[PDB]
Amino acid sequence: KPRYKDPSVPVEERVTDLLGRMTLEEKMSQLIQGDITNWMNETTGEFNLTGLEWSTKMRGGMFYVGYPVPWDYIADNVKKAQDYILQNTTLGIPAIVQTESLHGFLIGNATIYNSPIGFACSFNPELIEKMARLIGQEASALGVNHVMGPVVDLARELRFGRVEETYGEDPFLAGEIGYHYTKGIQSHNISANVKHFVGFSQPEQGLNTAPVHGGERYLRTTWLPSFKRAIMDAGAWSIMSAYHSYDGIPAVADYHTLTEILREEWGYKYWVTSDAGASDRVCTAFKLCRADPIDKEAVTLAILPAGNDVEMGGGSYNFETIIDLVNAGKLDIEIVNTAVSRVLRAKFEMGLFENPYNAAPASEWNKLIHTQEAVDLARELDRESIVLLENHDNALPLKKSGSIAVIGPMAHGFMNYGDYVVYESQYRGVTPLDGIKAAVGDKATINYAQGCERWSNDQSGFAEAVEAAKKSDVAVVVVGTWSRDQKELWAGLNATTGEHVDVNSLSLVGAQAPLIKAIIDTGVPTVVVLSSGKPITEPWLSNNTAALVQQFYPSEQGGNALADVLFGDYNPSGKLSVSFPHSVGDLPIYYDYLNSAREIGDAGYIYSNGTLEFGHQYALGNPKAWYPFGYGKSYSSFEYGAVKLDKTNVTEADTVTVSVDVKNTDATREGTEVVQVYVVDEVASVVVPNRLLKGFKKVVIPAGQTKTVEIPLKVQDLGLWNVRMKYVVEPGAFGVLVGSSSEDIRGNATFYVQ
Template sequence: MTLEEKQAQLVGFWVDQGDEVVAPMSDEKKSSTRYDEASAHGIGHLTRVYGTRPVDPVERAAWLWAEQTRLQRETRLGIPAIVHEECLTGLAAWKAATFPTPLAWGAAFDPELVEEVGAAVGSSMRQLGIHQGLAPVLDVIRDARWGRVDECIAEDPLVVGAIGTAYVRGLQSEGVHATLKHFVGYSASRAGRNHAPVSAGRREVEDVLLPPFEQAVRDGGARSVMNSYSDIDGVPFAADPTYLTGVLRDRWGFDGVVVSDYFSVDFLRSMHRAAADQAEAARLAITAGIDVELPSPDAYLTLADQVRDGRLAPEILDRAVRRVLTQKEELGLLDADFSAPPSAIDLDPRQHREIARRLADESLVLLSNDGVLPLDPQRTTRIAVIGPNADSPEALMGCYSFVNHVLAHHPGVPSGIELPTVLDALRAELPSAEITRTVGCAVEGDDDSGISAAVEAAEAADVAIVVVGDRAGLFGRGTVGEGNDVDTLELPGVQRRLVEATVATGTPVVVVLMTGRPYAIDWALPPRRSAEGVIVGLGAVNAEDLPESPHATIGDAHAPRPAAVLQAFFPGEEGGPAVASVLSGRVAPSGRLPVSMPRSAGSQPYSYLHAALGGRTDVTSADPTPARPFGFGLTYTTFTHSGLHVAPEVRTDGRIRASVVVHNTGEREATDVVQLYAHDEVASVTRPVAQLIGFRRVTLAAGARATVDFDIPVDRLAFTGVDGVKRVEPGRIRLWVGGACDDEETVATFDVV
């Protein structure tokens, strides 16, 4: 291969890039290179052929097959291009199925179902000649203010790793390579700001941020990785071989391809100021371990000349080219036949909608309920449906859905898929009810003129369903999503005022939160009691000060609050029917919080994985205790957990074999998420007060019991010691199972020896 042929394999080209802002600074980063010039010697990637504009999939496939054939026939080496697309909530293309956002995956606690989602997405991509998907996001949530929380799975690395790895397996089972992102530390930015510096210490990186990526590489066999935009302790990640080579390849054995996040190579020059020009940025990135520059030729167009004049060692260039060609061989591209493009494609078949519906059902988290849910058809014949998200298809989907990511720039183009809203679904679910619709207010802005009409509607109803929350978008176009970071965790706009005004009518109010992040809604939630009746999660509030009324807020016995609160994390195209079926009671909610529900933005960054001094203490008046903790979720029955048993001793190289009895003590079938937590009581470094080490979904009929067994490697308790070595340390471990991370309903201890 000539140097120009090698260089061409290490760049992508955004053939259809227009004026839409669908990537950071993409409006400023138009490639100055023409496609025919860039592909004269071949090309490594074609960027978002289907996902940049609304294009008919069959027509676009015909173009793609013809272009791949041209690359085979008209370039000297005849090597086709890898086609990559976004696929975080399904294939981000017109008319393709839109699944729940990853935060909803975490709420479902169901890796097997997420693997089905990955396989469904992969099957659509493969039909269209797409080879690589830019998902999953394995960033562990550290700060709810960060705009990209809706792209993340959870604040717990075990949940992120298990569910993210399941998605990798599903996608790759269809012959599409998954791309892990954003490696690593992106979500730990200061103050939750996008692209902001990361000040994480070695222990946080090793024990919290890296494990999901390691699991997806070692257990999931992921074939591609994408770098983080951020710097860690002052070193831009795109130029740091410590992780891109030392950890990823030398320690974990990854032998796939590392691609740059869009424009991140040039960002070494333009944003980090770590390179004087594009040539230096390219040299830093490829030496650190970034093999391919995306989305279009930019800094890597200097590589051939740098080899010629001795600034770049030829073996560094060859190393990256070898990896790309190996990937193309694995994908079958070197022998591909592009003579027969698909003539008919259904990107939203019934099977995909069924999977989307199951995941949406499982992801809904019931945060409070005074008995108004499920709705009684005999007592709720008049229903007022209120709120800006009640009749909004866009409110069902995350930032990287095609509707919110791309169609926002094409307002006259239909979505191409059925998107029944919560209002549509309630009318279908409750055909005999008299349902009225009032907006009340917008998602954003300070216009409260519509609240009076909402109050009138609530006063005339038996129950009011108020659907509020977010509108996902990018870089200021919305309330959550990439670049939409916030400094407050109050509901956007005047939505809290809308909720409080409807609650004040005295009509029972059910609040449905359709959001991409957890909001500070302690004002809407009652105090919480464990299975034994113990008050938990109240911070500085004394139990004897609690009001008796279930409709009174802590600290104010006269302030009313909603009768029920249901959390939906952007539940996708079938999210409307899923919400309606939970409200009606046809489906019992089974979701659990994958991220703590904060009391205020002032408690951020926060994680349930905090050490003792990271929680409520007597040496500060600031209380970070969340309004609802990680793992919390109610349903329409009650579960008890008892008889937790574990062997008294476990070797440092052994396995934790524990069992617990789960009992459905209510009157209907439902699903429990059995959560096994651990705490290392004395260790050489501070350890979390709670750490999830196992979880299992269990469905039980009314009155039924089951023994749930866990078989867990003890190295799930490993941590990085004072000397920087990760190990399992001997000592006493306390285990428990309960309704959330802070609910020690049944407890056992054992010694690691």
């Protein structure tokens, strides 16, 4: 009876015991990612035993299963791989089984939630946790025990294609959502995988994987906090390192971040994997070794001792030279032993040695995957993510009567999903047109016209659209950006957002802006719905439409959720997770800019009648956000009382509770507000962000009633990185600005740290 098999023995002693029974070859095998296709034929489902035996021996620690196949192909062949480990290897080390989960378990006919940038707008981390739990349920059903999420990168570069995959631009919010997500996944003993460590998503020129300029204080002030919450506090069992270099040091090879910060400072106990092909990039993109033939040893010497424990597939599998480098004396066995230990500790605490078989039987899959609870939750969360940008003279909510024109490329014909959905997902789900027809039934006339193709400047289709609008009491125009599923994205089909789809303009592409202009000119009240993955720059829309609504890439219930809002069954509650600029010329546009930024001189202006009004910052434009972070209106209005602090004179050990009474001045309907708390460190030893979101609360306030909102601020989380790169909460004054948005402040107070 070997000690590592005994669950009453403590985790460290189990790891120590298993580690001393392993050959170097078996150690290597834990640190190299395999793939299910090594033994599963992707088109037929046929099983290659030889392929299984080799993959287990050479790269058996964990394997990827994200292919667009039927459910049984994954379940049967995961099961066969775990049967084989258990009965046909000496040590029986269970496999970690990897897929994508970003806004849904990446398999055909599982539940699709709205894209991350969108559900960040909900400001509802409890509901996001519920989502992660149901995602975990769907994945666990087929034998998966690891998911490659959450993404805790920040949307600080709007031209970048993966903005949609983030939880917005603010460290705190992305931190809270990442924590709740990770916790909901790990409730099912499924490993999360926090990505992409660290500083990834401010690439130069906005281009996918390009390097990032920045210093250490910005890394520690802005980029790392969202990793810290998911890692230390939610106990994430795995981390993915990134494709970029940060101030010239590749993320996959950065000792300072991967070892000094992650292990020494934060106490991280588990493993880091490279991104896909990111090992090879060390020679091929960064030029830190010879690319042809690729210097496998150099790759390994750069990334394993830095702290990147596991090499992912998609590269040249450079970690096969581990054995050679250990025998040459060039790599100490302890470095390997530490990486292996990190992988095994994860597996013990996940419970994999006790229950390695995860999958439910074939007959239960339909009762675990795409359940009503999950569908309903997708509608609920999507509905709570929609942001009302504008609403003039009670144009919304619409009446369920009269005639309604439904116009635009995004209104029907295809579901406008974000990236990280499976092939052909776009052919199911509730479109905006579907949603509107089902909301009105027989009580109103719906006049549908496509208007234009999203990918064309052709205006052929405008006459049909204009006619639709002119014979209607109101017009809804659905436009935006679009992405592609995992097959069509990498086959090169046209898109405006997603991984490896970066833009040099945030204006509506093609015929979409003229389409809107054609409908407005009819004089019919025109509501624009932006259906998209990131900000869109059309400032003229604000005051030239009846109303303007933002639904970031929808869920499979997108159209029901949109109509819930359009017709008033749900009073819209979303707040912006990311700031909207006036133009791509104005970037970056994040609300948390350091003091001495943004607010400098006078802005100029180009009028639509042709007049130029010259200014300075800028000569003919405006560096201020068109819409700031945390902006969002309601059909109700909210009145804030005096802000009240439970403590005024405090120590860095204390918690200052922010209190404020919020009244719903709407007599007829219940309304939801997101009370936001911004902390300002008034006087500092180094330059700090002008303001920071440090707490918030989403509250449902009955018509005419008042609710008391309490938001805790832990003083220890409000510090800075001083000139010696030490974290300190300096004695002095801290402003507390409480509001409806990052600019829309309704009250303030001040506490004093001693």
